[PDB]
């Protein structure tokens, strides 16, 4: 309610804004298994090419 966002001086313009954010990370555990090494835990189903 007091910030500047883009070029809107938010208070003097009689505006407000919502700032929404999250922070996220992702990891895949593609190690060795009891069967052997370099194993990927993901398989994919895809359409055929053009």
């Amino acid at each position: 309610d007091q910030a500047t966002v883009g070029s809107i001086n938010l208070a003097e313009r009689d505006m407000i804004a919502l700032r929404l954010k999250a922070r996220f990370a992702y990891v895949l555990g593609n190690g060795a298994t009891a069967v052997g090494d370099n194993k990927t835990p993901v398989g994919a189903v895809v359409p055929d090419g053009s």
Partner: protein
């Protein structure tokens, strides 16, 4: 003038987690599948009709 993440250096500690570490161990198939015998000595004789 401002403070970057690189300019804070090792005041920000990197964390550790063991979530991906554990893997289930697998037993012999043949000890599940077949009747076992407890041996008391190196060698046992089993006669069969021939």
């Amino acid at each position: 003038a401002d403070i970057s993440r690189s300019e804070v250096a090792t005041l920000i500690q990197e964390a550790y987690a063991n979530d991906l570490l554990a893997s289930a161990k697998k037993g012999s198939t043949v000890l599940q599948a077949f009747p076992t015998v407890n041996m008391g000595t190196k060698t046992t004789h089993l006669p069969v009709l021939a």
